[PDB]
Design an enzyme around this catalytic site. Structure first.
Site, short mmCIF file in Angstrom:
data_model
loop_
_atom_site.label_atom_id
_atom_site.label_comp_id
_atom_site.label_asym_id
_atom_site.label_seq_id
_atom_site.Cartn_x
_atom_site.Cartn_y
_atom_site.Cartn_z
N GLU A 115 0.68 -0.94 -0.13
CA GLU A 115 0.02 -0.04 0.03
C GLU A 115 0.92 1.03 0.05
OE1 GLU A 115 -2.19 -0.74 3.41
OE2 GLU A 115 -3.86 -1.89 2.58
N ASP A 116 0.82 1.69 -1.03
CA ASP A 116 1.99 2.97 -1.44
C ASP A 116 3.32 3.01 -1.27
OD1 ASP A 116 -0.57 4.61 -2.36
OD2 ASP A 116 -1.57 5.05 -0.39
N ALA A 117 3.98 1.69 -0.43
CA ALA A 117 5.00 1.85 -0.73
C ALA A 117 6.22 1.65 -1.58
CB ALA A 117 5.77 0.47 0.29
#
Ligand SMILES: [Zn+2]
Ligand SMILES: [Zn+2]
Ligand SMILES: [Zn+2]
Lengths: 149, 46, 1097, 50, 66, 50
Positions: free
Chosen positions: C727-729
RNA sequence: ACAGAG
């Protein structure tokens, strides 16, 4: 105006022409360094004005001297008996033209570098290659004849 | 042995010793910057 | 057939940015203040007069502002640069000089320059030292050529008077009440008095309400008070339709119930309803001639022009009750903006009147009593009434003027210097009217009236969404006009006077009113000839070019707005389906024959307005023009503001993504200016090796962003790698961070003052306290030079001192105690410079400038310039990366799951355009509503041997075998944000506690600790955890014991109950401390919490 | 597993259907505009004409 | 602030090509010809010279000098 | 910020920590990676027994 | 008292 950490970083990435099969690893600690496992360079650049300067005074190449610190101002300083194990001109930075800092008259740089031996997995300034890679070999084949236009 | 300070505008040594209002000896600029230390400092090239 | 196209039409915008818009609004208001308004306020306060002892007077003649100065210790004066006033923590002001004429018996004694106050000079105004200088002369002042200005300097910090957003005064708002009734109101504000009047229809009969009357009096009695006594003339002025008379009838029927048939009777009725501050008649006549509808003028107690206005109000209420056409507050023809000059005018007027009142008080004290030798008031011109008033009202942020009942807060903010966009983005903010009272959802939306005037996407995300806005790129805010020739032109164009007719002409179908800022100029037939002739007189250079005109065909009015503080926007005039600007005109602009004012004069470019583009019809492009088009849009990328002009292809994104980039783009690490090294700020973040963007908007070239950028070009493959990018990393590269990617600098500050007191003693700094055993200073004094001050170039660890201060504890020899300034901080820091300066009060100011180099790690937040923000999750080596056939292995692997639910196609095109532009040395534009297309960058990749859609054949790096799908390589401009994990990690075991409530302190700087909230208590109850709720909220905060008397129930001490005077019923109880605090706050309130204990079985 | 601009590009099978569907919808909306402004519109139950 | 010594993606020594890059733009080249005459094949090395701003030449103007 | 909402029903505690988070799937679903700088500060009273 | 962040 270049900071001390940024200057240390830029001097970290300049490649050294020393053969790494002749040196050994520096032990844990051992902050002095001996004849076997280190080298030592010395950068010292003082920037002054030019005693003859024209009336227009436009470009910095005429007004100043030693205002562009290249990597050719790095001077090797031997330790122990390293003066005979390497002839004069085999311990130097490689590319002879890398810009490190840039000066204005009255500013001075003096430092003392300590090269050691390290693998590339530790830090990326030890990587011996620019980039090393490979590809497979293509074999384009023509299934039907392609003729004409 | 005396404390030499650097002026900001004209870049000259001043040697402020006595308890005075801070002012350059040669110009009217009233801001001093200390000089660099003389002790060596060690950095890692990383 | 295609309409022919002018292609260089864009070039009007760099000509427009030479003069107007883009902080030049603030500059043109501050120059307006210090060049006309400081004379006009002095004109209306030109004479003070003592009450006792006449034939004595002080007369002001002329006022000035002058050049900025500093007043040093030994009475030497010199001009000053703004950066010297930044460093020394002093204001940047200029002395106000006024010449006077007073009397000491000898009747005419004058002066020439009497300093009464100091005006803070705003940067790049007419009196600053920076205006009119060359970029090589900013070097001798330590100032950037690109620093915009518009901000003040008060006591060392940079403060910005923000743009306010206020409703227009002197305008009839027809609105609904809470209960459903429809009434009207007009905030009749002039320079002298502000007051609201109302119009209530609470029973079907009309009432008027005001803050002076103790009861709402009916409107027909007010008409009979204002000189019109017949009921027929009142019903004429209201209206002559059938339903209008039917709606108005029960108000005449109320007025005839009382005996009010005469003017003196009506005034005697009003005077019996006035709240008291000749009484009955005259306190009503002066009331209706000075306070109710106080902007409509009565000349010599002639009340005709106010009767017509209040009849217009009643008729608009009657017509709006039938069909619910209430006026919305959110239409931006009704909003006005108030710049820095119009606030400083009110502030300086109140300060100058308080100055004159204090001087009149001193004059009335020393004229009747003391001495026959005639005193001069030059010996009582105290300067600290004006100076400290200006500096305290700018620096604090409140403008509490008692004369005008203005009680604003939070006007000024500290100018943010995180990056270059953050300083320029703050100079275009517009604070709103409501300021976060309740969740309105009515003005927080995006009304269509903000076309081209304000920005669609640039708003904060959170509690101020829609209540903090931003100007567009090509807007302008007007000032107050001279109001002269507009009436002299309108009186020659068929406008009948309003006095020469009864009220029946107002209800005709072919008779329109004309207004000028709320006052009725009369009536007119054939309004189209009026509007067209007035627009020709505006284009021909006679009427000033910002005087707008409009026509409300429903309410039958022709508005004229000469007022100041309303939004304009330039446009190209179109006459019979052809633009007035030809290719020849733009060639003449590019060669330098003409400027933008010549486009204004020749009827080629005219300014519109939000009320005036309600009439007009505008085409976006040249091929939208049909026969009913009067104007042409110049550039549609001027719809987007300054902070949204960094985004490439911003019309391909979804609209919240541009908002998140407008939030993140003010926080990217970058470079402040060219003076970023000679600058000592509280906090400054720099980037080591910044790079200018590869895909850039034209707004970037217009505001010179790429001369000092914020971000670095990252080679980005878009694939799923290693599972640490869920998630968005995003997964970085260890061999790119070692080579300088993302390297940042953190500069902080540590200031220390050394003051001299009223008792003749002084603070002092001792030398480094040596150790006599080893002849070296101790570890806590290791870095000190011999002057007691830390020296530049050395490393500063935790709790080592920087200034070895000592102050006297006077509360005969001096008793000194040590009060050093110690470096608190998690990691080590270096010193770059130590500044030393002094003020005139023998105080010494010392400023250090620290430095930390931070390398990216697991936890550092990067951004994407499209809203795909993300923290780092994993740092892999160069060997574990996937790699191409050419040997390129990416820095930042990005997860492809961000794209479907967010629909950022602009990143997918920025990548491709940057890749096709690095192979042949171009910068492909990503200009809004245009830019380089996809079909022109697909053909530059195939010419250089790559794929036409960026997807590349990838041999993996772990296994050595190729991947199945192709991976999508290209450079994306990633910027580094200020949110680092080394300044957010925090851990408290046990430490300092508060004094009142014995429980840990507030924030990270105080070693605070975290809070079990009111909602996490509600979650531990849901698990049924009783002892965990006890351990968190009793034992690990404030566990305590109390001597509880079991007999009476009070609290004792040490086993001794002083109430009972006995020691056989005391006992110990496990209690929280904030309850023992509660049980003694309440006994002081005479609410006695008598306990009763039992055994603990 | 990667994404790209060739994963959202419309082919030839969409740029001919989109034009015809936009034309059909625009012509039916123009017909309903013309039938409201100048005469009879068969009004749905429980609402006004607009 | 100044030209970085190595390219970030691969590791080719870029930081000696800058004074030659401006010297080949003194002789009226396009940038795509100068980046080929310096020998930069891959595009990650090309963006090190193509996207670089020279802030040290204008930060040194405000630096203190005698 | 009164007593009953600020200092009684919910109050500031110690033995706590607050840091930015970042993903890691090599741990189990009931684990959490505490940094060394927080684990040296946050202590637990371990009673000595046999 | 204001700005941020989730
Ligand atoms: Zn000086
Ligand atoms: Zn008792
Ligand atoms: Zn490279």
């Amino acid at each position: 105006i270049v900071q001390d950490e940024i200057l240390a970083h830029r001097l970290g990435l300049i490649p050294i022409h020393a053969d790494p099969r002749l040196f050994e690893y520096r032990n844990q600690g051992d902050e002095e360094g001996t004849e076997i496992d280190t080298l030592q360079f010395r950068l010292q650049v003082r920037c002054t004005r030019n005693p003859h300067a024209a009336k227009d005074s436009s470009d910095p190449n005429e007004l100043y001297v030693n205002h562009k610190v290249y990597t050719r101002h790095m001077t090797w300083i031997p330790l122990g008996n390293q003066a005979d194990l390497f002839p004069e001109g085999t311990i130097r930075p490689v590319h002879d033209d890398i810009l490190i800092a840039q000066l204005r008259p009255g500013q001075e740089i003096d430092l003392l570098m300590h090269c050691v031996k390290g693998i590339g997995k530790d830090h990326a300034k030890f990587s011996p290659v620019a980039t090393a890679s490979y590809r497979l070999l293509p074999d384009i084949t023509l299934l039907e004849p392609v003729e004409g236009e | 042995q005396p404390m030499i300070y650097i002026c900001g505008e004209c870049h000259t040594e001043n040697e402020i010793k006595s308890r005075d209002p801070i002012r350059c000896r040669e110009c009217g600029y009233r801001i001093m910057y200390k000089k660099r230390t003389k002790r060596l400092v060690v950095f890692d090239a990383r | 057939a295609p309409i022919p196209t002018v292609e260089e039409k864009w070039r009007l915008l760099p000509a427009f940015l030479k003069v107007k818009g883009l902080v030049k609004q603030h500059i043109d208001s501050f120059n307006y203040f210090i060049n006309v308004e400081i004379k006009k306020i002095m004109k209306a306060n030109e004479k003070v007069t003592s009450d006792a002892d006449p034939m004595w007077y002080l007369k002001y003649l002329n006022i000035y502002v002058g050049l900025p100065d500093v007043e040093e210790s030994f009475n030497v004066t010199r001009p000053v640069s703004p950066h010297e006033c930044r460093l020394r923590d002093m204001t940047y002001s200029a002395p106000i000089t006024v010449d006077i004429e007073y009397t000491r018996g000898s009747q005419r004694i004058i002066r020439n320059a009497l300093p009464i106050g100091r005006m803070p000079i705003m940067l790049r105004s007419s009196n600053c030292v920076l205006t009119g200088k060359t970029p090589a002369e900013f070097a001798k002042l330590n100032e950037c050529p690109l620093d915009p200005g518009g901000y003040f300097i008060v006591k060392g910090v940079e403060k910005v008077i923000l743009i306010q957003e206020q409703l227009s005064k002197n305008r009839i708002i027809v609105e609904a009440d809470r209960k459903g009734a429809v009434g009207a109101s007009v905030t009749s504000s002039t320079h002298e008095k502000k007051s609201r009047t109302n119009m209530a229809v609470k029973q079907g009969r009309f009432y008027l309400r005001h803050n002076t009357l103790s009861e709402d009096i009916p409107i027909v009695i007010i008409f009979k008070a204002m000189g019109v006594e017949s009921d027929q003339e009142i019903v004429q002025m209201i209206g002559t339709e059938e339903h209008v008379m039917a709606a108005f009838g029960p108000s005449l029927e109320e007025c005839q119930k009382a005996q009010i048939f005469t003017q003196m009777q009506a005034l005697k009725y009003i005077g019996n309803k006035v709240r008291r501050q000749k009484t009955k008649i005259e306190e009503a006549r002066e009331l209706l001639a000075s306070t109710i509808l106080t902007h409509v003028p009565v000349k010599e107690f002639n009340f005709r022009a106010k009767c017509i206005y209040t009849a217009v109000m009643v008729r608009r209420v009657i017509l709006a009750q039938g069909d619910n056409k209430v006026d919305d507050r959110d239409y931006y023809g009704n909003k006005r903006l108030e710049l820095a000059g119009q606030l400083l005018s009110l502030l300086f007027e109140d300060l100058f009147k308080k100055f004159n009142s204090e001087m009149k008080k001193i004059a009335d004290q020393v004229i009747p009593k003391q001495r026959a030798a005639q005193f001069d008031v030059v010996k009582h011109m105290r300067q600290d009434q004006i100076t400290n008033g200006m500096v305290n009202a700018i620096s604090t942020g409140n403008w509490s003027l008692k004369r005008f009942k203005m009680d604003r807060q939070g006007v000024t903010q500290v100018l943010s210097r995180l990056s270059y966009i953050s300083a320029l983005g703050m100079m275009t903010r517009i604070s709103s009217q409501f300021e976060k009272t309740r969740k309105v959802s009515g003005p927080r939306s995006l009304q269509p009236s903000q076309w081209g005037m304000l920005c669609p996407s640039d708003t904060p995300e959170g509690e101020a969404c829609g209540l903090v806005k931003n100007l567009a790129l090509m807007t302008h805010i007007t000032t107050d006009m001279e109001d002269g020739p507009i009436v002299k032109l309108a009186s020659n164009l068929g406008v009948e006077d309003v006095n020469l007719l009864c009220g029946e002409e107002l209800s005709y179908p072919n008779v329109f009113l004309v207004f000028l800022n709320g006052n009725i100029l009369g009536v007119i037939r054939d309004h189209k000839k009026l509007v067209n002739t007035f627009r020709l007189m505006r284009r021909a250079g006679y009427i000033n070019e910002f005087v707008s005109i409009s026509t409300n065909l429903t309410d039958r009015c022709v508005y004229i707005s000469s007022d100041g503080g309303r939004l304009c926007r330039p446009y190209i005039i179109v006459k019979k389906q052809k633009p007035a600007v030809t290719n020849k005109h733009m060639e003449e602009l590019a060669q330098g024959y003409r400027n933008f004012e010549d486009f204004l004069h020749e009827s080629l470019v005219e300014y519109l307005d939000v009320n005036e583009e309600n009439d007009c019809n505008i085409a976006l492009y040249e091929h939208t023009i049909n026969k009913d088009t009067t104007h042409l849009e110049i550039e549609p990328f001027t719809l987007l503001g300054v902070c949204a002009g960094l985004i490439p292809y911003p019309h391909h994104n979804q609209s919240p993504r541009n908002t998140y980039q407008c939030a993140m783009g003010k926080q990217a690490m970058g470079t402040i200016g060219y003076n970023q090294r000679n600058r000592i700020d509280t906090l400054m973040y720099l980037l080591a090796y910044p790079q200018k963007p590869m895909v850039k908007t034209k707004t970037i070239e217009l505001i010179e962003f790429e001369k000092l950028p914020a971000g670095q070009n990252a080679t980005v493959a878009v694939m799923s790698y290693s599972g640490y990018d869920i998630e968005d990393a995003l997964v970085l590269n260890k061999a790119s961070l070692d080579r300088g990617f993302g390297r940042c600098l953190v500069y902080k500050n540590a200031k220390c003052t050394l003051k001299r007191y009223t008792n003749q003693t002084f603070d002092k700094v001792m030398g480094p306290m040596l150790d006599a055993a080893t002849r070296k200073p101790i570890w806590r004094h290791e870095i000190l030079d011999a002057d007691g001050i830390c020296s530049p170039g050395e490393k500063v660890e935790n709790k080592q001192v920087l200034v070895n201060k000592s102050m006297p504890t006077v509360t005969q020899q001096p008793q000194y105690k040590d009060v050093p300034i110690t470096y608190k901080g998690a990691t080590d820091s270096y010193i770059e410079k130590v500044m030393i300066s002094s003020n005139a009060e023998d105080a010494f100011l010392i400023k250090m400038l620290l430095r930390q180099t931070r390398r990216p790690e697991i936890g550092d937040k990067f951004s994407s310039r499209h809203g795909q923000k993300g923290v780092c999750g994993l740092i892999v080596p160069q060997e574990d990366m996937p790699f191409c056939d050419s040997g390129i292995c990416p820095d930042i692997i990005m997860n492809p799951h961000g794209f479907p639910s967010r629909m950022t196609v602009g990143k997918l095109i920025e990548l491709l355009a940057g890749k096709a532009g690095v192979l042949d040395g171009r910068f492909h534009y990503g200009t809004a509503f245009g830019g380089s297309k996809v079909k022109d960058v697909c053909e530059d990749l195939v010419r250089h041997g790559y794929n036409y859609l960026g997807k590349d054949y990838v041999t993996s790096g772990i296994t050595g075998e190729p991947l199945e799908a192709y991976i999508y390589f290209g450079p994306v401009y990633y910027q580094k944000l200020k949110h680092m994990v080394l300044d957010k990690m925090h851990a408290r075991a046990r430490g300092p506690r508060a004094v009142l409530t014995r429980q840990p302190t507030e924030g990270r700087s105080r070693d605070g600790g975290l809070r079990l909230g009111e909602m996490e208590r509600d979650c531990l109850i849901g698990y049924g955890a009783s002892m965990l709720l006890l351990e968190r909220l009793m034992i690990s905060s404030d566990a305590f014991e109390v001597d509880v008397c079991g007999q009476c129930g009070l609290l004792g001490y040490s086993g001794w109950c002083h109430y009972c005077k006995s020691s056989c019923h005391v006992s110990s109880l496990r209690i929280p401390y904030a309850c023992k605090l509660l049980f003694q706050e309440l006994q002081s309130m005479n609410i006695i919490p008598r306990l009763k204990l039992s055994k603990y079985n | 597993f990667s994404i790209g601009i060739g994963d959202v590009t419309p082919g030839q099978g969409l740029l001919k259907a989109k034009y015809e569907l936009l034309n059909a919808g625009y012509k039916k909306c123009d017909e309903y505009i013309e039938a409201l402004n100048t005469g009879k519109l068969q009004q749905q139950p429980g609402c006004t004409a607009e | 602030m100044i030209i970085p010594v190595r390219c970030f993606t691969c590791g080719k020594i870029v930081g000696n090509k800058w004074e030659a890059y401006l010297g080949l733009l003194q002789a009226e080249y396009t940038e795509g010809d100068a980046l080929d005459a310096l020998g930069l094949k891959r595009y990650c090395c090309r963006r090190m010279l193509l996207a670089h701003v020279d802030l040290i030449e204008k930060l040194l103007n405000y630096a203190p000098l005698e | 910020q009164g007593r009953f909402r600020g200092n009684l029903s919910g109050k500031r505690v110690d033995f706590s920590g607050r840091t930015v988070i970042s993903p890691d799937p090599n741990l189990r679903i009931d684990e959490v990676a505490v940094p060394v700088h927080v684990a040296k500060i946050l202590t637990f009273p371990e009673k000595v027994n046999k």
